Amino acid sequence: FEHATTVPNVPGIPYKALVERAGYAPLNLEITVVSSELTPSTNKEYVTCRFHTVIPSPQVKCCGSLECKASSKADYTCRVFGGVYPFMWGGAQCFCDSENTQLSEAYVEFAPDCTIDHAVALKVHTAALKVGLRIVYGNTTAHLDTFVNGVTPGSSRDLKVIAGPISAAFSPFDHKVVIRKGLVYNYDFPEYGAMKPGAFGDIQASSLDATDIVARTDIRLLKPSVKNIHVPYTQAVSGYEMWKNNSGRPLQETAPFGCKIEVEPLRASNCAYGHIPISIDIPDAAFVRSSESPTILEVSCTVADCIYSADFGGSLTLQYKADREGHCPVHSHSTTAVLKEATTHVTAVGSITLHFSTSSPQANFIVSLCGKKTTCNAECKPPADHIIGEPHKVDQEFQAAVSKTSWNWLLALFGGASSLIVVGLIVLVCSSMLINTRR
Amino acid sequence: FEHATTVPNVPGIPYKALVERAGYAPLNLEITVVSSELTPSTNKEYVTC
Amino acid sequence: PTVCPVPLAHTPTVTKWFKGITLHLTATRPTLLTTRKLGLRADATAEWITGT
């Protein structure tokens, strides 16, 4: 048998439904989203970290000339200066006071500690939502991992299910992402090749060990002034450190819908949003025909004190008269009320006490036991507490969200005007007819 | 579960109430003022004889 | 990499009220507090708190 439904994508909160096959007895179906995983597809644009500004030892053409070559190092910078006459320790290095040029050379590499202290830049694409699901029907429970797309089916050894698509697609990750020691940030990093000094991604490479490092750190060489040998240079601060200071909080503390961000691979687990349409082919073997199941003869409902809150703060009793001892599934046919128990032992005659949670100010909902339906009417008070450490298990609607006192008052006030306008219309009509008749 | 009552200040006479949490059975609460002392803020001004 | 020990701050005192909470906080040193809503808008707030 195939059944279609819409489950709320909220982890940990059970959703209950009743499948009513005409030939067979009704059967329960309870569904729990054990875990979810919204994972995107990502490609590594580059990696960045603190750059080590390495300065090769300067050379001097002692009484000649030099020309700057064209190397392919990261942010390579080479300059040639005129006569310097440098000192090392012995008071002289050359014999020509003039025409004693010097070559100042400098570039950048990855710091030795970047193997741990580095940030990886990624771009995200459309994300596929995967769900781990626990579903129980009658006696049989089943765990299954499935893809919420509407095409890919999940299977557990006799049971086939298809889920999705999500009602409203959502992704906490912006187009561009940065990963830093597992922390996730949504930063619009510069594209590969578009280095800018003093900001994030001023040094880029395909990998830590990649030798084709490209960087733009605004390094510039100055003329050596003091007598002793040295190569002066001024360079913009590391933009990696600048971003680190101004990184802000990671995505683990800012993602909405209570979605837990994780890495390796990038993913968002336990992300509660939207509804999943599920079509499931529950096998007919588990079904039990009504001729063998106990069909109760007459049942009535008496509701005790009830309260509308996330917790199970409502209680009721079903006084039932049946014909056999069995295991009736009890259910609620309202979207603003959910029971605790699913299958209840039914005797020939007796009573069963049950619990329920509702979101409406009133309990005005139909309860079914082995098919027989009875309307329970109650009046639930506002909750005494203010906060719970548990989620609201039922959505709050508009129709079944106002008490019958308020409903009666509003309907009376509006029907007063409606009655008034219709009596005015019939008064006008009867006056016209009387004028015509007695004319 | 916070329950608020207005217990009469009478020693020796129990005050009985029923707390009814919605999803739980009612419970009985007996509240008995066994002793009660009212002490004022005192300060010796002097003695005499 | 290895495992480092870090302190645990004094547990907050939560006072409830209609659609809201009040956290009384005590931290002799700067302690980070990060709150966020679980709806469409995160409304994320981060603050380093000292004293009481």
The DSSP letter of residue C11 is P
Pairing of strands C13-17, A275-281: unpaired
Asked if the C-beta of A255 comes within 8 angstroms of chain C's C-beta atoms, the answer is yes
Closest chain C residue by Cα to residue A391: C38
Cα A219 to Cα A238: distance, rounded to the nearest angstrom:
11
Q: How far apart are CA A196 and CA C32, in angstroms?
A: 33
Contacts of A340 in chain B (CB under 8 A): none
- Which of C36, C38, C41 shows the shortest C-beta gap to A253? C36
- What would you report as the CA-atom Rg of chain A, rounded to the nearest whole angstrom? 38
Instruction: Print burial letters for A82-94: b (CB count within 10 Å at least 16), e (below 16).
Output: eebbbeeeeeeee
Long-range contacts of A340-346, Cβ-Cβ distance < 8 Å, separation of 24 or more? A340/A312, A342/A16, A342/A28, A342/A30, A342/A136, A343/A28, A343/A138, A344/A369, A346/A294, A346/A296, A346/A320, A346/A322, A346/A370
Cis peptide before A361 (omega within 30 of 0): no
CA distance A358 to chain B (A): 12
Q: Are A204 and A48 in contact (CB under 8 A)?
A: yes
The CA distance from A306 to A367, in Å, is 15
Tokens 């259910």 belong to residue: A331
C-alpha to C-alpha distances, A179 to A94, A144, A184, nearest whole angstrom: 52, 31, 5
**DSSP secondary structure letter of residue A307:** B
| Residue bearing tokens 């030939």 | A23
Q: Nearest CA to CA, how far is C46 from chain A (Å)?
A: 8
Give the gyration radius of chain B's Cα atoms. 20
**Token pair 């808008």 in the structure block, residue:** C41
* Upstream peptide bond of A112 is cis (omega within 30 degrees of 0): no
Longest dimension (CA), chain B: 69
Element (H, E) at A303: strand A298-303
Chain C within 8 Å of A387 (Cβ-Cβ)? yes
Residues 6 or more apart whose CB falls under 8 angstroms from that of C27 comprise: C9, C10, C49, C50, C51, C52
Alpha-helical segments (H) within A172-290:
239-245
Longest dimension (CA), chain C: 46
CATH fold group of domain A296-379: Immunoglobulin-like (2.60.40)
Dihedrals phi, psi of A390, to nearest 5 degrees: -130, 155
Q: Is chain B in touch with chain A: ≥3 Cβ pairs within 8 A?
A: yes
- DSSP states along A268-281: EES---SEEEEEEE
Would you state the torsion angle of the CA atoms of residues A221, A222, A223, A225, taken in this order, to the nearest 10 degrees? -130
Contacts of A254 in chain C (CB under 8 A): 36, 42, 44
Q: Which residue has the tokens 């991604």?
A: A201
Q: Rounded to an integer, what distance in angstroms lies between the CA atom of residue A138 and that of residue A352?
A: 19
Q: Give CA–CA dist A228/A231, Å, rounded.
A: 10
Which residues from chain A sit within 8 angstroms of residue B18, using beta carbons? none
Q: Count the Cβ atoms, other than its own, within 10 Å of residue A156.
A: 16
| Enclosing H/E stretch for A102 | strand A102-110
Distance separating alpha carbons of residues A21 and A330, to the nearest angstrom:
16
* Contact predicate C34/C45, CB 8 Å: yes
C30 to chain A, closest Cα gap in Å: 16
Q: Distance (Å, rounded) from C-alpha A336 to C-alpha A396?
A: 7
Residues paired with A38 in a beta bridge: A129, A268
Is A312 exposed, middle or buried, given 0-12, 13-18 or 19+ CB atoms closer than 10 A?
buried
Distance, CA of A106 to CA of A78 (rounded, Å): 6
User: Would you list the DSSP string of A392-422?
Assistant: -SS---SGGGS-HHHHHHHHHHHHHHHHHHH
Nearest to A253 among C17, C20, C34 (CB): C34
- Prior bond to A165 cis, omega within 30? yes
The pair of three-digit structure tokens given for residue B37, joined into one six-digit string: 């002392």
* Cα-to-chain-centroid distance, residue C4: 21
Strand bridging mode A275-281 / A159-163:
antiparallel
| Residue A271 · residue A40 · CB < 8 Å | no
Using DSSP bridges, classify how beta strands A176-180 and A233-234 pair: parallel, antiparallel or unpaired: unpaired
d(CA A272, CA A182): 22
Q: Give the C-alpha separation, A389 to A409, whole Å.
A: 36
User: Which amino acid, residue A208?
Assistant: L
- Number of inter-chain CB pairs under 8 A, A vs B: 21
Give the number of other Cβ atoms within 10 Å of residue A137's Cβ: 22
What residues of chain A, 353 to 392, have a C-beta less than 8 Å from chain B?
A: 355, 380-381, 384
The answer, for B46 touching chain A at a CB cutoff of 8 Å, is no
What is the C-alpha separation between A161 and A135, in angstroms, rounded?
A: 10
CA torsion sign for A308, A311, A313, A314 is positive
User: How far does chain B reach from its first CA to its final CA, in angstroms?
Assistant: 58
Rg of chain C over all Cα atoms, to the nearest angstrom: 14
- Strands annotated E in chain C: 13-17, 20-24, 27-35, 45-51
Burial of A14 from C-beta contacts in 10 A (0-12 / 13-18 / 19+) = middle
Question: Quick check: B23 contacting A, CB < 8 Å?
Answer: yes
Longest pairwise C-alpha distance within chain A: 140
CA distance B21 to A304: 11
Residue A355: its chain B contacts at CB < 8 A?
23
Which residues of chain C approach chain A closer than 8 Å at the C-beta? 1, 14, 16-21, 34, 36-42, 44, 46
- Identify the H or E element spanning A435: helix A404-438
Give per-residue burial for A42-80: e unless 16+ CB within 10 Å, then b: beebbbbbbbebebeebebbeeeeeeeeeeebbbbbbbe
Residue type, A404: K
- A236 Cβ contact partners less than 8 Å away, ≥ 6 residues apart: A197, A198, A202, A217, A218, A219
